[PDB]
């Protein structure tokens, strides 16, 4: 099933070039820029104090360059990582929030299609 192969089975090559075309599409969605660098405190009081395991798209980037994940459960984890820290930080009426919800969904479709594709 494709939740065990999530969990368990080791991304190959052709698997990361997958992931990167994931992230790329991330990148390129037009809710996504407030999600493409850290978080500045300048942006964000207490930000840092808050969100215990800050997250972002660049260094999601520099991750999957430098072959970090194992397995495509640790990829969605640092993915759900950025938008459940917005949604956490921030009220439900922030534009922030607002942007998570949007390309959460968005990141589930595509998150899908890479899944269907493994086989
Ligand atoms: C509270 N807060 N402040 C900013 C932010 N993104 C920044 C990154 C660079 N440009 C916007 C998010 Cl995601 C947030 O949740």
């Given at each position: 099933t494709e939740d065990a192969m999530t969990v368990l089975t080791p991304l190959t090559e052709k698997?990361?070039?997958?992931?990167?075309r994931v992230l790329r599409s991330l990148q390129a969605h037009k809710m996504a820029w407030p999600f493409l660098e850290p978080v500045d405190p300048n942006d964000a009081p207490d930000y840092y104090g808050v969100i215990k395991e800050p997250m972002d798209?660049?260094?999601?980037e520099?991750?999957?360059?430098?072959?970090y994940y194992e397995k495509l459960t640790e990829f969605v984890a640092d993915m759900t990582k950025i938008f459940d820290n917005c949604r956490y930080y921030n009220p439900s009426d922030s534009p922030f929030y607002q942007?998570?919800?949007?390309?959460e969904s968005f990141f589930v479709q595509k998150?899908?299609?890479f899944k269907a594709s493994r086989s």
């Open positions: 698997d990361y070039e997958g992931l990167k798209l660049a260094t999601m520099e991750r999957v360059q430098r072959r942007c998570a919800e949007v390309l998150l899908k299609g």
